[PDB]
């Protein structure tokens, strides 16, 4: 749908068989969740943001459903204070900015 | 314009008489610039992001031009890795998400 920005643009997602809420985040290259449990192998990665860097687990080729749309791609797991859907997934569901 | 997300959604802005580039960032509540020089009084603020907290100067009622569109609002100044236009400004220029 269309989403305005008067509130945080939070949507419901399903990932790894679990239900979560996440912020649609055009300022994020990648997608990051806290407190989810994904199957399989992963690789450690350091990512940078406001206030410095944080250690995450990188999982590849993870299916995700984002407000009803299917995507597959890399998901980072680490201590973000809010779950974020980044451009690697947003491009797959046809998300654009408009003004 | 409409902006797709295959690349970072960077736009040109004018703020405090200076020209900068900045990321349209729907995951940002506030607007944050590195190395601009704004006039007048400000107050210290700590903000949180990925990897922790950072100290910023808070300037209020600052005029900004975002991709040709006029807004006025709070601008935070501090050591962000990339300049970010947040929802406090995006709502003023009619920015929405669409998918
Ligand atoms: C984490 C989000 C929930 C918030 N943020 C916005 C995101 O869009 C950032 C933007 C950014 C992009 C960069 F390139 C580098 C950066 F430092 C920052 N994205 C990011 O950190 O991305 C990371 C990771 C994700 O994937 C890749 O892409 C880039 C890298 C990389 C790995 S913010 O900046 O912390 C922010 C902004 C305004 C604001 N106002 C406030 N006000 C009140 C106290 C409520 S709190 C507050 C917080």
CA–CA separation, A15 and A19 (whole Å): 7
Measured on CA atoms in the order A69, A9, A24, A93, is the torsion positive or negative?
A: positive
How many Å is the Cα radius of gyration of chain A? 13
DSSP-derived pairing of the beta strands A69-77 and A32-33: parallel
Contact between A83 and B1 under an 8 Å Cβ cutoff? The reply is no
Q: Which of B28, B24, B89, B21 is nearest to B59 (CA)?
A: B89
Measured on CA atoms in the order B78, A29, B52, B48, is the torsion positive or negative?
A: positive
CA–CA separation, B8 and B3 (whole Å): 10
Q: Which domains does chain A have, with CATH numbers?
A: 1-99 (2.40.70.10)
Q: Cα angle at A95 between A93 and B1, to 5 degrees?
A: 155
In sequence order, what are the beta bridge partners of B88?
Answer: none
List chain B gaps (C–N > 2.5 A) by preceding residue.
none
**Active-site residue set of B:** 25
Alpha carbons within 13 angstroms on the beta-carbon side of residue B83 total: 17
Q: Which of B84, B94, B98 lies at the smallest CB-CB distance from A96?
A: B98
Contact between A33 and A58 under an 8 Å Cβ cutoff? The reply is no
Q: Which residue has the tokens 């940002």?
A: B28
Tokens of B60: 């209020």
CA–CA separation, B37 and A48 (whole Å): 25
Q: Which of A26, A49, A94 lies at the smallest CB-CB distance from B50?
A: A49
Experimental method: X-ray
Residues of A with CB under 8 A from a CB of B: 1-6, 8-9, 23-29, 32, 47-54, 67, 69, 80-82, 84, 87, 90-91, 93-99
Contact between A97 and B96 under an 8 Å Cβ cutoff? The reply is yes
Kindly give the number of the ligand 1 atom that is closest to the alpha carbon of A80.
1
Contact between B86 and B23 under an 8 Å Cβ cutoff? The reply is no
CA–CA separation, A10 and A33 (whole Å): 13
CA–CA separation, B15 and B62 (whole Å): 8
Q: Strands, E, within B6-98: which ranges? A: 10-15, 18-24, 32-33, 43-49, 52-66, 69-77, 84-85, 96-98
CA–CA separation, B90 and A7 (whole Å): 11
What's the reported resolution, in angstroms, to a tenth?
A: 1.7
């Amino acid at each position: 749908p269309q989403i305005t920005l008067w509130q945080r643009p939070i949507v419901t997602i399903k990932v790894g068989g679990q239900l979560r809420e996440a912020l649609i985040d055009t300022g994020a290259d990648d997608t990051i969740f806290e407190e989810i449990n994904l199957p399989g192998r992963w690789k450690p990665k350091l990512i940078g943001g406001i206030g410095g860097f944080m250690k995450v687990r990188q999982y590849d080729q993870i299916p995700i459903e984002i407000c009803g749309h299917q995507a597959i791609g890399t998901v980072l797991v680490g201590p973000t204070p809010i779950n974020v859907i980044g451009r690697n997934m947003l491009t797959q569901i046809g998300c654009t900015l408009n003004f």
